[PDB]
């Protein structure tokens, strides 16, 4: 019912985090998998009815989907000149603010 590829989780660099966000883990479906305490697995995986219902709750309602992110915002349009102007403005504003705070107080 749920297509994992259409959930917007295909733009994640870290493979382990990407598998975690879909509620999938290739290791745990193996019949010889043993968790830290030492209990064998029954082959269910993270979720038993993953094939019946498509995916897990993690793969049903994700809260971090880089695919839906806007193509803008990862690069600043104003470039280096904008950053230089911002640096000048922030230095000027910090100086003005500290001067106003000192002057209006009782020294």
């Amino acid at each position: 019912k749920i297509d994992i590829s259409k959930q917007g989780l295909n733009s994640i660099q870290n493979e382990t985090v990407k598998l975690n966000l879909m509620g999938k883990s290739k290791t745990m479906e193996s019949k010889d998998w043993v968790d830290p305490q030492g209990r064998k697995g029954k082959g269910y995986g993270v979720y038993r009815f993953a094939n019946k219902y498509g995916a897990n709750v993690d793969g049903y309602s994700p809260i971090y989907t880089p695919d839906t992110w806007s193509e803008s915002g990862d690069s600043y349009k104003l470039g280096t000149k904008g950053l230089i102007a911002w640096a000048g403005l922030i230095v000027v504003l910090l100086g003005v603010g500290i001067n106003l705070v000192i002057s209006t107080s009782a020294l």
Binding site: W69, G73, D74, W86
Partner: protein
Amino acid sequence: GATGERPFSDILTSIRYWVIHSITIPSLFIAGWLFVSTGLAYDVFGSPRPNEYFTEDRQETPLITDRFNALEQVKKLSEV
């Protein structure tokens, strides 16, 4: 599960967002500091400064007794 607005995690990790908001938040903080330090807070909302809780006329707590002359009574009680 998208209602048609930019994701919050997309906005909060933007150079443009942190360039705009490196000015607005400190500006508001300084504005509040100047509002308190310049004495505007006392005058706008009528709170007593530490040196004007008790006047030379009365040395007890204020008490309002009239409902329709309440404005004039509180004007008289607040006299410095």
